[PDB]
Design a protein around this ligand. Sequence first.
Ligand SMILES: NC(=O)c1ccc[n+]([C@@H]2O[C@H](COP(=O)([O-])OP(=O)(O)OC[C@H]3O[C@@H](n4cnc5c(N)ncnc54)[C@H](OP(=O)(O)O)[C@@H]3O)[C@@H](O)[C@H]2O)c1
Length: 738
Amino acid sequence: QPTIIYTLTDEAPLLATYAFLPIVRAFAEPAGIKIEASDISVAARILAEFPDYLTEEQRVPDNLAELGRLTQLPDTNIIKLPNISASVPQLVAAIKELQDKGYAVPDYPADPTDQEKAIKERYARCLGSAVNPVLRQGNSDRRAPKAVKEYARKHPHSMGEWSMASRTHVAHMRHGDFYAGEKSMTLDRARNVRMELLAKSGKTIVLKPEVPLDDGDVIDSMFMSKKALCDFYEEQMQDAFETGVMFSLHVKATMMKVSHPIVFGHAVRIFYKDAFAKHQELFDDLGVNVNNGLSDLYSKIESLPASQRDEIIEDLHRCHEHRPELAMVDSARGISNFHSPSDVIVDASMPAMIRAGGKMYGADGKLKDTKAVNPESTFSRIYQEIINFCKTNGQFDPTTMGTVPNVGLMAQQAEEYGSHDKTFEIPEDGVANIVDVATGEVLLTENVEAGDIWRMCIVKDAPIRDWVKLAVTRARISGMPVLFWLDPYRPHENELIKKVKTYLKDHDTEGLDIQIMSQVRSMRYTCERLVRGLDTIAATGNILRDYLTDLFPILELGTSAKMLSVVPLMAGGGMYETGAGGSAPKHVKQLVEENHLRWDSLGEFLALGAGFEDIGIKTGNERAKLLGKTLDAAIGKLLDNDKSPSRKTGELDNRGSQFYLAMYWAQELAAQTDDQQLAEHFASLADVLTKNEDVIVRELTEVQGEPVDIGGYYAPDSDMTTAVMRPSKTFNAALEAV
Ligand SMILES: NC(=O)c1ccc[n+]([C@@H]2O[C@H](COP(=O)([O-])OP(=O)(O)OC[C@H]3O[C@@H](n4cnc5c(N)ncnc54)[C@H](OP(=O)(O)O)[C@@H]3O)[C@@H](O)[C@H]2O)c1
């Protein structure tokens, strides 16, 4: 019997799931589809990491590992909702919540003894992007379905106006970064390699004892110079200061050492260098680590009195006299860009800024132009290109702009997403080599200094072949041209270009428009096509998959959540991600304090539809196909009637939107002529929901406008949460009536 695995994650999509999962079960049941919820929240992965601190009834199965195993089975069907890639501050808050709820888990040891070392290494498995590289055992097919795009045309979202006199720009390192020192090769034979450091002292230091590589694999060695980074930060801060432009920092602190986000910490320390020069000793003696953001500092600071503490505060603020204005995460609560490494994440933050007309919030609460610092230049030039494009051509127009589907290479922890266990902080000056364990042959070499970050990346041949095949597939299906975003001046992408040229001859590409251009040129070409209403498929790497699928859909649709995101698993299974965005922690706020969830579940709906249709196609379950068809049509009706959630408290939210979806779905099922008994089963529900529409709607807007308790954040209580998320007794009783 068919099983759909439905992920329980964190925050907004979690709450939405508390309001929607009962609906899904009530619809999947008549079709003999089991709905199996899998808790992969941060709290859950924590508990699953530490069972030897837990009781009998407290313990939790390693659900992530289970899903991992499931990815290798043909009959697997996963609805993946966005989940938190926890930073250390978030991990800490979560741990606090658990312990306070009586789960007595060990504290996180920032500075460890030898047991606490081990528990830190264990807690590392709960840090950063721990889910997606496991689940993503196929390449990415992301695109906006035509009904969604047409809704976007009929009801354009707010788009910030772009000034030709905008001073907004991207500052990135022009030397000393991963890009500049990158080296790359394609293996001709299977090899086993070692990442080691030839210290100038003569001593060899091994950082990675063994990395198995396959024939045809593309590997890269890259490093970021600490000297170059810190100098870069200094010069950019001074430029921003002199020009009077607001400083912002846009990085992925999780694609780095999640325990030691060096790129972030250095920015913080250099910004406040005048303060840090005066309290270095006390900060060290306090265990201060601004790699986990300025927040960390503040925490360690609280134990102090208010004489040498307010002196610190005064020094930190004194630093603002010589440093530029600083972009804010929350102007109301005084949350700056430096507060936490995870607040401002490049993939979401840059598009947000571009959508705003090149602007972010300063301390005063106003939108201003910004120097958007993306230290790593590898994938940030494209942002400067689209920014100059907006400065020149004004903001985009969702009513007329074309679309940019993405075919993303990500299968088997491809590239930088798989380099978590091959990323090191260089301990001392010397030569960083990748050597054959058998021959001792140096495959790749870099000259590195102490404090540098050295990374090895791998992308395997089979995912590349499937990536090209998916590109061609999508080109032939959609009739859109395909553009491979590959910079031949980047060694990795050059190797990939060889791959693509080779594998394009393994498919009928006759009458297909398939080109390869550099990332910047590809971005430019794509925009020039966009403003003309022309479509272009972006066939890209993993990072670019992330970046572009946040950027373009936000411009086109207001949010990347309204996207179709299908991962055809290598083993034949299916994963369907509910959009391309994250867990939207800002929505949780408005919910807990105003009982309005502005989370759009359209991504869940689309993903679910694709899932049902695929189950139907694979198993020959006609009823599954019927659920697919009827759900897609019901989504069409949801869009036609603009029953999407509103931002405003007191107006339609996630729950009412879900209700309308249920209604339309029921109607579509009562109207179909393929399964009479099914039509009969859903006729009753359809009539009940259609009859009591105003009653249920009213029941859903009643509760709106008042603070609400879900009994937690990282581990909210199921019953309280379900009490809040399903407050319509009428609706609930209608669903319970089967
Ligand atoms: N695939 C994944 O699992 C995945 C991917 C990316 C990020 N994440 C995680 O998500 C967390 C937060 O990421 P972030 O704050 O950088 O970006 P984000 O979660 O995408 O949220 C940024 C903004 O996008 C809009 N948005 C996102 N999803 C929406 C939806 N379903 N309906 C309506 N609007 C939506 C919201 O804007 P408004 O405030 O204007 O409504 C939201 O504040 C991070 O911890 C990150 O690790 C997970």
